[PDB]
C-alpha cells in the first residue's frame, strides 16, 4: 500500500491520501524559527531552543497529532465546515479530496470539497522569525458562495515543561491582547520584547478574533469541532491567564470561479506582526519570500547531482537525503514528534558525525557546529556528551564520559578543511569547555591521546553501555568499535600532519596507529566464526564469538574494522560475509544476531532490551551506511548496492502497511526479525543515518572525495552499471564527472582525463568559477 | 447556576448535570494506591509516588480530561454505544441522564439511557493496591436487550516524564500479555515483580480483549469513538512496545427488568490480578470492601461532629473539609489535575501546616508526617523546602532555604502531643537530614534558635520572595509574617517547656519571645494607616504603609500579628478592621491591596505578577482561616463568621458560572477584584486552606482545643447564635459538648459543668471509653 509518490520535477513528496498510518512530517525554517509539521498540519514551532522557546503547543504520542497550525473554512449559507488539512475536522474522504506536498522547507496543503478549492502553503521565510500561511480560496461551483476562514494555534508557555506540567504557575504566566489583524501573545515573565512575545496576524482586516482557547474551542469540544467555527464567529476574547490561542476570522463572498488570496503569520517579537501583516498584503512579497526558499535549496542541491541507473538512489541523493542530512546539522536531534522535551542542544557524537556530511552545501553551518563541538570539549580531550552550544557562545567528569564522542570529530574536521580549503582553521584558538584554550590542531591531538590512554591491558579502547543511555561508559569493558574508530581518526590525522609537514606528529601517531592495529588484529578476530568480536567484558570475556548462543555477530565492530582501514582485505571480506549472511534482511542490516535473551550486566543494557528492538537485534539504521563504505573498500559494489537498496526508504513507497514511517526519510531503527512488527520503521528525520548515507553514497559508492590537495574519483558500483554522471561543486569550481564502465567491473580506475588531458592521481583544485570536464574510465 | 447538591444523609455530593465548566474531582485510596478521578471519569492512578509510579496516563490542561477509567456500553442489536460516565462518548444530554455521586474515597457513576440503566462505582479498597470498578447493568426496557461492556485505561510508562517525553525510550519500555480475564502490563525495565507490573482484570470471562491502544481506539479515533467499541469486539491485541491499554469485553443478554453485576480491577503487582478477579466474582466481597471504606470515614467523622445554626458550616466540618484536610496529610500536595509532574514528595511548610489539622481523626498518619518533617530538617535548624520522605525512611544550603518552613512544625508537634498524649515523643531520637541526631525536643529548639539568628538589625526575621518560587529567601529583606510566626511558635514552645518543667528553656524562650514582641511593636506598626506592614526591603524601606500607592494592606502580616498573640487587642482590632475594609469581598479576603503594578525587585516577584492573580491581589485562600482565628481572639464572632461564609465553597453551590471549581472543596486562590474573572476559583483539593479552615473552625470558632493537661472549650460565635453542640473524641474518651448562649454574647464562658458538676478551667482527660456531658454557658 502507498499513500503518495515522489515528484522529481518539483522536488516534493506528494501525499494523495491523508489517512496515513502515522504523521508524515516536514521541517520548515532554515535559520532560527523552526516548525515540525505533519501532513495533517499537526505539529509545533520553536525558536532556537525547542526546550525553552517553544512557540505553539503539542500533545505528543497520542492518536491525533494536535494541536497544529489549522485553517478552518465554513460555508456561511449551510453552516458546514472543514479544514484545509484533513484533520482536525476530518471530512469524509468520500466527499473531500486532500493532497499534501512536502517540499524542501515548505509544505503545501490542498482540499477540494463541495465546490470550494482551497490551498494553504506553510513556510518560514528567510530573514524573518515567523511562519507564513499562504492561503488561496477558489469558488469552483456554479453559484455564489460565502466562505469564512478561521485560523488556530495554541500558544505555548515557552518552556516545554511549563506546557506539560506546573500549570499552577504557567496558567497565570501569559496573556493576549488584540490590535487590528493581530493577536499579541505576552509571556508575562519574559521581559525581552523579542523573545517574550509571540503573535498570530492576518493580512486581512478580521471580522472577529479569539485569544482564549476555551472560548474558540468551547466547552467539551476540541480542535475537531471548535465552537467559534460551528457558530460562524469568534467571541473576540483576549485576557490575561489560562490557555491562549491565535484565531483570526474573515468572511468572503465569492462569485463562481472567483478566488482570493490572503495570509496568516505566526511569529515572534513585538512590532514584527504589524509589520509583516502589512508587508504580505502585497502577495508579491509572499511569492518573493517563497522564491527565496526555492533558491536556498536549488543552490544546495546543485552542488552535487547524480544521474545513475538507480532511480531510487538519484531521487534521494539529489534531494531528500541531502535535505535530511542538512536538517540534522542545522536543527540538531531534539525537535521532532518523538523528541519533544528533556534533551536539548547538541549531542556530541551525533553532531560530530552529522557535520561530516554536507560541508559542500552548507560550509558555514558545518563550521559553526564544528566550533560548537570544539568549545564543548574539555582539556582532558573528551567531549561533553550533551550540551547547549549557547553556553559557550561568546561539565561532567570521566564517569559520564562516552568513549567515542570526541573521536568522530577528527575525520569531520579534516573533511571540512578538505572541502573548503580553510587550512588556517587548524591554527584558530578555541577555548576548552573547562577552561584554557588551544588551537584546533591541538584540540584534535588531545582527543587522539585520550583514547590512547583509556585502553585495557591488551590495548583495546574502554567503552561499554551499562545503563539505558546510549553511552559507552569507561567504567569497565573494552569496545572493538571504539578501537576501530580510533584507528580511523588516527589515519585521518596522520594524512593531515603529513599534509601540514608535521613530521614529529606523523611519527607519533603512525606509531600509535600501528599499535592499535596490532592489538585489534591479535585480540579481536574470531577465527572460528570468521569475524571481529564486539569487545570484552570488564572481566576479560570476549563478547561476540562463534561459540556463544546469543549476540554472535555485530554490525558495528565488523563494518568499522573495514571502514577504518584497519582490517586486511581477507579478514574484511570474511567479516562482511558474516554480516551479510547473519544480519541482512529485506529491510536492512540487523545490529546483531542472535538477539540477547538473558540479562547480563557484564555485556550491557542491551541484554535487558526486547528482542528485535533498539540495540538488541533491531535494524539500527545508523551503522548500515558503514557497511556500504566497508563494501566499497573491499571492491564489492554489488554487495554495497544490495544493502543500499534494502534500506532506501524510496523503495518502500508501496509497503507503508509494514513500514508505517515516511518513505522519504531514514529512521533511527526498524523492528528486527525477532519482533512481531518486523519491518516497522521508527523515528524519522533526526537520525545520523541520513548524514552517513549521504556521505557513503557520494564519497564511496560514487567515490567522489575532496582532499587537501585534490579531488578524487574512485567509484565502487554494481558491475552491470554502464556508468554514471555527477556534477560536483568544489571550492568554487565545477567538476562535470562522467564515469564509464565498458568492461563492467565494480571498482578500479583505468584512466582519468581533465579537460581532455590525461592525468594521474587527484584532480588539482581549478580556478574559481571554472567548469571542468572529468572523464573516468573504469577497468 | 448549579450542577449538583450536597446529600448530607449519604455524605456525598450529587452531580445531576455532567456538563460542568471544569472537571470536578475526587480522591480514591487511603493507603498507597491513589486515583484522582473526575465526574467524567477522567483522571489517573499512581502508587506511592505520583512522579515515578503513575499507573494510567493523563493528558493535562486540555479541553477534555483524558484518558480515564472508562466503561463503554454497546447495544449489539443497533450498534449504538455510550459510556457510563458522560464523557468520552458524550451522548446527548437530551437523550441520556447522568448522575455522579462523589463520596469519601469512592465515586458512583450512573447513566440512564434508552432503556438501559447502568451504574459504576470506582473505589480503592483498603488492603489492596488496586481500584475496583463495580458495574451494574439493568435492562429497564420492555424487550430483551443484548449489551456489551468494554473497559479502557491507557497504561502509564510509570515515570511522568516518560509519558510526556523521551518516547524514543519509553515506546519500547513495556508490553502486554493476556491470560483469562487479565491483561498483564509489564514495565520491562522495572524488574520488581510488584512495582514493575500493572494489570486490568475482569470478574467475567472475556469474549475479547485489547492490550494495544492503537488497536482498541483505532486509526484517527480517540476515546470518544473507539474502533473496538464501534465494531463491537476487540482485536485481541497484546505485544511488546508502543502504547498499551487495558480493555476487556463481554456481551450480556438481558431479559426485561434483568440486571447483572460484575467488576473490573485496575491494579499493581504480579499475581494480584488473577487473585482479585476471582475474589470479587463473589460480589459479597465487593460489598464488604465498600463497607470497609464507609467504616473508614464513619470512624473519622464521628470524632468531631457539630450541630449549629449554620448549615454550611455543619455540612463542611462534619465531612467535606475534614476529608479535604486529611487528603492533604495522606497524599501530600503534588497529585491533582493541576499538579501533574515535576514536584513530588513533601513540601516542608505545606505538610508542617497540614499536619496540625486532623490528629484527632488520623493520629498515625499525622505522626508519620511529623517524623518525615523532623527527618527532613538539617542540624542548622531549617527544613528542606521540598523532599521525598522515602529518602530518609530506614540537601540544600541557606541560599535555597525558605525562612518560615521549620517554624510551622512547632505548633504542629505541640498539637499532636496535646491530642494524643504521647508525651514520650519529645524524647524520641530522630536523625537530621544532613547527619547526626537529636531528640524531637532538641529538633524544635534548633528551629526556634535558627529564626532568632536570622534577623535584621532591628530584630525582624529575614525572608522575602525574590523569584517565582513561593519561598521566603534569606538573601535580604525582612518579613513581618515570619517574625509573627516565630512569636507564635515561641509561645507554643514556652507552654510546652512549662508543662515539661524545663525552667531553663522557659526563661530562655520567654526572653526570646519578649524581644520579638518589642521589635515587632516598635518597627512594624503603621500608625497612619492603623495596621502592620508586610516587612522591609533589604535597603530598609518599609513595605505596606499608608503612604504607598500600591500594596498598602497585607493579609498575612495583619492576621498573624493577632493569631500569634503578639498584637495587643487594640492594634489587633484596628489592623483587622483595615483587613475587613480594604481586603474583604463576597468571595473572601484579598491577600493585599491595592495590587502592585510596578515591578520592584526590592519588594519581590509579586510586583511582576498579574493584578488580582496569585500573590498579587488575588484572594489567596490559605491565609483566610488565619483571619477567622484572629477575629475569635479579638472576640468578634460575627466578623469571623462573615469571613467564613464568604469563602465557604458550600455557599457558592449556585454560582458555578462564576466560581467554576468544586463547591465542596477549598481552592488555592480565587481571582481578585482586579482581574476580569474575579470570582473564579483555582486549584481545588490540595491546598493548605482545608487544614487551616478545619483547625480554625473546630478550635477557635467552636473553640474546642485539646491541651497537655485538659480539654478547653472557649467559643467565639455570632451573637445571634442561641448555642451549638459538638461531639468530640479525645484520647479515647467522648465529650458531648453543649454550648448555651442565653445572653447572646459572642465570647466569654460564664460556667462549665462536667457530668453535672461545675468545674473551673480545662476538662481533665477522662477514663478510656467514658462518655462525658459538658455544658458550657456563655456570658
Ligand atoms: Ca513578555
Ligand atoms: Ca587566547
Ligand atoms: Ca562556472
Ligand atoms: Ca517488569
Ligand atoms: Ca542514636
Ligand atoms: Ca464510650
Curated annotation (Swiss-Prot), chains A, B:
EC number of the protein: 2.4.1.280
The keyword Translocase is assigned to this record: no
Broadest EC class assigned to this enzyme: transferase
Active site (record annotation): 470
Positions with a binding annotation for N-acetyl-alpha-D-glucosamine 1-phosphate: 333, 343, 349-350, 468, 470, 615, 622, 668, 687-688
Alphabetic keyword roster: Carbohydrate metabolism, Glycosyltransferase, Transferase
Family classification: Belongs to the glycosyl hydrolase 94 family.
Role, per record: Catalyzes the reversible phosphorolysis of chitobiose (N,N'-diacetylchitobiose or (GlcNAc)(2)) into N-acetyl-alpha-D-glucosamine 1-phosphate (GlcNAc-1-P) and N-acetyl-D-glucosamine (GlcNAc) with inversion of the anomeric configuration. In the synthetic reaction, is also active on glucose-1-phosphate with 10% activity as compared with that on GlcNAc-1-P. GlcNAc is the best acceptor substrate, but the enzyme can use aryl-beta-glycosides of GlcNAc as the acceptor substrate with 10-20% activities of GlcNAc. Shows no phosphorolytic activity on cellobiose.
Protein name per its UniProtKB record: N,N'-diacetylchitobiose phosphorylase
Organism: Vibrio proteolyticus (Aeromonas proteolytica)
Amino acid at each position: 500500500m502507498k499513500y503518495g509518490y515522489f515528484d522529481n520535477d518539483n522536488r516534493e513528496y506528494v501525499i494523495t491520501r491523508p489517512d496515513v498510518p502515522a504523521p508524515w512530517t516536514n521541517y520548515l525554517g532554515t535559520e532560527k524559527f523552526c516548525t515540525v509539521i505533519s501532513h495533517n498540519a499537526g505539529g509545533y514551532s520553536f525558536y532556537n531552543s525547542p526546550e525553552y522557546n517553544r512557540v505553539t503547543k503539542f500533545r505528543p504520542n497520542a492518536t491525533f497529532d494536535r494541536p497544529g497550525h489549522y485553517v478552518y473554512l465554513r460555508d456561511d449559507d449551510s453552516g458546514d465546515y472543514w479544514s484545509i488539512s484533513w484533520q482536525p475536522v476530518a471530512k469524509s474522504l468520500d466527499e473531500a479530496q486532500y493532497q499534501i506536498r512536502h517540499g524542501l522547507s515548505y509544505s503545501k496543503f490542498q482540499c477540494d470539497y463541495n465546490g470550494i478549492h482551497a490551498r494553504k502553503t506553510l513556510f518560514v521565510p528567510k530573514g524573518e522569525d515567523a511562519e507564513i500561511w499562504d492561503v488561496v480560496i477558489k469558488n469552483t461551483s456554479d453559484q455564489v458562495r460565502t466562505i469564512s476562514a478561521f485560523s488556530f494555534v495554541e500558544f505555548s508557555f515557552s518552556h516545554i515543561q511549563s506546557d506539560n506540567q506546573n500549570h499552577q504557575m504557567s496558567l497565570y504566566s501569559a496573556g493576549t491582547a488584540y490590535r487590528p489583524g493581530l493577536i499579541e501573545y505576552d509571556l508575562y515573565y519574559n521581559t525581552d520584547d523579542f523573545e517574550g512575545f509571540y503573535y498570530l496576524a492576518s493580512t486581512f482586516d478580521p471580522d472577529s478574533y479569539d485569544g482564549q482557547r476555551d472560548r474558540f474551542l468551547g466547552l467539551y469540544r476540541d480542535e475537531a469541532n471548535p465552537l467559534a467555527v460551528e457558530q460562524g464567529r469568534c467571541s473576540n476574547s483576549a485576557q490575561t491567564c489560562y490557555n491562549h490561542c491565535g484565531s483570526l476570522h474573515k468572511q468572503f463572498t465569492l462569485q463562481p470561479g472567483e478566488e482570493i488570496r490572503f495570509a496568516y503569520i505566526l511569529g515572534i517579537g513585538k512590532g514584527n506582526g504589524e509589520r509583516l501583516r502589512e508587508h504580505y498584503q502585497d502577495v508579491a512579497n509572499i511569492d518573493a519570500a517563497f522564491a527565496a526558499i526555492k533558491a536556498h535549496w536549488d543552490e544546495r542541491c546543485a552542488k552535487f547531482q547524480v544521474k545513475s541507473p538507480n532511480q531510487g538512489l538519484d531521487t534521494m541523493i539529489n534531494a531528500w537525503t541531502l535535505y535530511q542530512a542538512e536538517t540534522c546539522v542545522v536543527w540538531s536531534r531534539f525537535a521532532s514528534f518523538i523528541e519533544v522535551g528533556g534533551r536539548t542542544g547538541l549531542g556530541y557524537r551525533d553532531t560530530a558525525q552529522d557535520a561530516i556530511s554536507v560541508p559542500h552545501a552548507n560550509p558555514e553551518m558545518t563550521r559553526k557546529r564544528i566550533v560548537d563541538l570544539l568549545r564543548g570539549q574539555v582539556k582532558a580531550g573528551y567531549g561533553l556528551h550533551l550540551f547547549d552550544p549557547d553556553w559557550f557562545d561568546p561539565i561532567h567528569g570521566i564517569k559520564d564520559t562516552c568513549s567515542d564522542d570526541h573521536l568522530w570529530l577528527i575525520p569531520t574536521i579534516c573533511k571540512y578543511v578538505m572541502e573548503t580549503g580553510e587550512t588556517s582553521f587548524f591554527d584558530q584558538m578555541i577555548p576548552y569547555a573547562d577552561g584554557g584554550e588551544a588551537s584546533v590542531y591541538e584540540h584534535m591531538k588531545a582527543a587522539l591521546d585520550f583514547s590512547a590512554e583509556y585502553v585495557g591491558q591488551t590495548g583495546i579502547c574502554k567503552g561499554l553501555r551499562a545503563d539505558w543511555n546510549d553511552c559507552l561508559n569507561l567504567g569497565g569493558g573494552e569496545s572493538s568499535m571504539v578501537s576501530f574508530l580510533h584507528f580511523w581518526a588516527l589515519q585521518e590525522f596522520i594524512d593531515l600532519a603529513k599534509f601540514l609537514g608535521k613530521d614529529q606528529d606523523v611519527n607519533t601517531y603512525t606509531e600509535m596507529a600501528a599499535n592499535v592495529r596490532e592489538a585489534c588484529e591479535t585480540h579481536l578476530w574470531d577465527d572460528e566464526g570468521g569475524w571481529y568480536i564486539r569487545g570484552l567484558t570488564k572481566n576479560g570475556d570476549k563478547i561476540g564469538t562463534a561459540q556463544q548462543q546469543e549476540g554472535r555477530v555485530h554490525l558495528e565492530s565488523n563494518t568499522l574494522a573495514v571502514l577504518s582501514g584497519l582490517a586486511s582485505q581477507e579478514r574484511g571480506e570474511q567479516a562482511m560475509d558474516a554480516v551479510d549472511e547473519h544480519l541482512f534482511s529485506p529491510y536492512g542490516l540487523h545490529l546483531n544476531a542472535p538477539s540477547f535473551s538473558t540479562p547480563n550486566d557484564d555485556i550491557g543494557f542491551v541484554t535487558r532490551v526486547y528482542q528485535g528492538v533498539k540495540e538488541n537485534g533491531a535494524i539500527f539504521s545508523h551503522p548500515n551506511p558503514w557497511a556500504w563504505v566497508a563494501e566499497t573498500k573491499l571492491g564489492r559494489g554489488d554487495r554495497a548496492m544490495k544493502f543500499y537498496d534494502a534500506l532506501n526508504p524510496y523503495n518502500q513507497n508501496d509497503i507503508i502497511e509494514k513500514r508505517i514511517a515516511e518513505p522519504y526519510s531514514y529512521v533511527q531503527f526498524i523492528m528486527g526479525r525477532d519482533h512481531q512488527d518486523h519491518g516497522r520503521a521508527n523515528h524519522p528525520w533526526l537520525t545520523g543515518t541520513s548524514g552517513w548515507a549521504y556521505f557513503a553514497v557520494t564519497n564511496y559508492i560514487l567515490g567522489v572525495q575532496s582532499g587537501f590537495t585534490g579531488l578524487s574519483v574512485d567509484p565502487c558500483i554494481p558491475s552491470d552499471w554502464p556508468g554514471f554522471e555527477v556534477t560536483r561543486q568544489w571550492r568554487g569550481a565545477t567538476y562535470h564527472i562522467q564515469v564509464e564502465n565498458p568492461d563492467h567491473v565494480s571498482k578500479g580506475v583505468k584512466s582519468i582525463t581533465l579537460n581532455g588531458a590525461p592525468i594521474q592521481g587527484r584532480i588539482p583544485p581549478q580556478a574559481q568559477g571554472s567548469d571542468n570536464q572529468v572523464v573516468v574510465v573504469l577497468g
